[PDB]
Design an enzyme around this catalytic site. Structure first.
Site, mmCIF file in Angstrom:
data_model
loop_
_atom_site.group_PDB
_atom_site.id
_atom_site.type_symbol
_atom_site.label_atom_id
_atom_site.label_comp_id
_atom_site.label_asym_id
_atom_site.label_seq_id
_atom_site.Cartn_x
_atom_site.Cartn_y
_atom_site.Cartn_z
ATOM 1 N N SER A 153 0.168 -32.569 88.364
ATOM 2 C CA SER A 153 0.193 -32.522 89.824
ATOM 3 C C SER A 153 0.409 -33.872 90.494
ATOM 4 O O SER A 153 0.636 -33.894 91.708
ATOM 5 C CB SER A 153 -1.089 -31.893 90.372
ATOM 6 O OG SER A 153 -1.096 -30.482 90.205
ATOM 7 N N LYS A 201 3.194 -34.577 93.070
ATOM 8 C CA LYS A 201 3.104 -34.155 94.461
ATOM 9 C C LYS A 201 2.969 -35.328 95.413
ATOM 10 O O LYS A 201 3.333 -35.196 96.583
ATOM 11 C CB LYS A 201 1.967 -33.139 94.642
ATOM 12 C CG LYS A 201 2.237 -31.827 93.910
ATOM 13 C CD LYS A 201 0.993 -30.958 93.750
ATOM 14 C CE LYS A 201 1.285 -29.761 92.868
ATOM 15 N NZ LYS A 201 0.041 -29.034 92.498
ATOM 16 N N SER A 241 -3.796 -29.794 96.018
ATOM 17 C CA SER A 241 -3.038 -29.660 94.769
ATOM 18 C C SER A 241 -2.387 -28.282 94.644
ATOM 19 O O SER A 241 -2.222 -27.757 93.540
ATOM 20 C CB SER A 241 -3.886 -29.988 93.538
ATOM 21 O OG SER A 241 -3.116 -30.670 92.562
ATOM 22 N N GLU A 299 6.482 -26.196 88.913
ATOM 23 C CA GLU A 299 5.169 -25.677 88.552
ATOM 24 C C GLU A 299 5.284 -24.207 88.163
ATOM 25 O O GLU A 299 6.059 -23.456 88.761
ATOM 26 C CB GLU A 299 4.207 -25.837 89.734
ATOM 27 C CG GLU A 299 3.834 -27.279 90.059
ATOM 28 C CD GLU A 299 2.768 -27.819 89.137
ATOM 29 O OE1 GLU A 299 2.347 -27.076 88.228
ATOM 30 O OE2 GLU A 299 2.348 -28.991 89.317
ATOM 31 N N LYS A 350 -4.823 -38.549 94.187
ATOM 32 C CA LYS A 350 -4.115 -37.335 93.808
ATOM 33 C C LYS A 350 -4.411 -37.089 92.339
ATOM 34 O O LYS A 350 -4.085 -37.925 91.493
ATOM 35 C CB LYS A 350 -2.607 -37.493 93.993
ATOM 36 C CG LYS A 350 -1.825 -36.230 93.618
ATOM 37 C CD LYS A 350 -2.025 -35.126 94.661
ATOM 38 C CE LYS A 350 -1.913 -33.736 94.043
ATOM 39 N NZ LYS A 350 -3.177 -33.310 93.363
ATOM 40 N N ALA A 371 -3.830 -32.040 86.234
ATOM 41 C CA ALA A 371 -4.388 -31.460 85.021
ATOM 42 C C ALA A 371 -3.346 -30.566 84.367
ATOM 43 O O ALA A 371 -2.550 -29.912 85.051
ATOM 44 C CB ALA A 371 -5.656 -30.641 85.301
HETATM 45 C C1 LIG Z 1 -2.128 -30.171 89.357
HETATM 46 O O1 LIG Z 1 -2.027 -30.629 88.227
HETATM 47 C C2 LIG Z 1 -2.273 -28.812 89.762
HETATM 48 C C3 LIG Z 1 -2.790 -27.906 88.882
HETATM 49 N N1 LIG Z 1 -3.194 -28.122 87.636
HETATM 50 C C4 LIG Z 1 -3.652 -27.081 86.748
HETATM 51 C C5 LIG Z 1 -2.490 -26.224 86.244
HETATM 52 O O2 LIG Z 1 -1.726 -25.689 87.299
HETATM 53 C C6 LIG Z 1 -2.964 -25.133 85.284
HETATM 54 C C7 LIG Z 1 -1.798 -24.412 84.675
HETATM 55 O O3 LIG Z 1 -0.798 -24.964 84.283
#
Ligand SMILES: *C(=O)/C=C\NC[C@H](O)CC=O
Ligand SMILES: [Cl-]
Length: 270
Positions: free
Chosen positions: A46, A49, A106, A142, A210, A213
């Site tokens: 993430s 972003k 996120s 994503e 920010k 994961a």
């Molecule tokens: C940022 O990293 C947003 C989400 N993270 C967790 C994942 O979306 C879980 C699945 O892939």
């Protein structure tokens, strides 16, 4: 000296937990820096972003887009971890709302809609190159980009490259004044990461961050620390290859925060 002490502690932390850890810290006050694996590639998850919001804000600065433009999207477009966009599917969201949801919450669908506005992952990579970042590459959207397979260069950055992007966006001239402040506001407002870098910082300091994961025990936290006294500090922390729980991974990042805070405190004390 404080930078060498911090690097020593990061080596020990990484070995105690069997992870691969990438950290870049740069204090604008003392102009000092420390790092661990700062030029190695790590999955962004993430953290992309931050760049996507910056790219959209930069377009708005130029009139190439409008933050007030309402974006409509479909039920099939909603990917996992979309706490803002999911409930608002029938009503749509402005570009500003999507920037805020992507950074503060996120929100994954918000991130994808920003990418679509930029023309896809290649638009994100091209934006990074325009900031002087020759390492970061986005290849997928994503949640495919969270795979985080070791050895895969897709969807990666380096701790040092991302720290450079934080400087340009939040402290330099990449964005106009109002856009820079909005991005800072969204980073400060994120309550994601409360148990990561924030947990190791003194309670009198502030952080706009920010998180990210992903697969293979990937857990990241990047942003700007505003200490009680003195100038902002850029921090870029990427952790991967952890065999432990998310709770345990968050505690490793909290220890990175403590290490960084102690070095900054020593730089403030001389
Ligand atoms: C940022 O990293 C947003 C989400 N993270 C967790 C994942 O979306 C879980 C699945 O892939
Ligand atoms: Cl800026």
């Amino acid at each position: 000296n404080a930078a060498a002490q911090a690097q020593r502690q990061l080596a020990l932390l990484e070995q105690r937990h069997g992870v691969r850890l990438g950290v870049q810290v740069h204090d604008r006050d003392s102009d000092r820096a420390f790092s661990h694996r700062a030029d190695e590639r790590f999955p962004m998850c993430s953290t992309f972003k931050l760049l996507a919001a910056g790219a959209v804000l930069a377009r708005a600065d130029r009139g190439d887009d409008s933050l007030r433009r309402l974006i409509r999207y479909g039920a099939a477009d909603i990917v996992a971890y979309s706490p803002v966009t999911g409930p608002r599917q029938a009503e749509g969201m402005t570009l500003e709302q999507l920037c805020e949801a992507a950074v503060t919450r996120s929100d994954n669908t918000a991130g994808n809609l920003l990418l679509s506005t930029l023309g896809g992952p290649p638009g994100l990579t091209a934006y990074a190159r325009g900031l002087g970042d020759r390492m970061t590459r986005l290849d997928r959207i994503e949640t495919a980009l969270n795979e985080a397979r070791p050895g895969d260069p897709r969807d990666t950055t380096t701790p040092a490259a991302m720290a450079g992007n934080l400087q340009r966006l939040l402290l330099g001239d990449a964005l106009q004044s109002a856009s820079r402040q909005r991005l800072a506001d969204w980073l400060l407002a994120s309550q994601t990461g409360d148990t990561r870098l924030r947990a190791g910082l003194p309670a009198g300091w502030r952080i706009g961050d920010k998180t990210g994961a992903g697969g293979h025990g990937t857990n990241n936290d990047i942003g700007v620390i505003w200490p009680r006294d003195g100038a902002p500090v850029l921090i870029s922390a990427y952790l991967t290859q952890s065999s432990a729980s998310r709770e345990a991974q968050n505690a490793v990042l909290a220890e990175v925060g403590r290490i960084a805070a102690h070095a900054v405190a020593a730089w403030r004390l001389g």
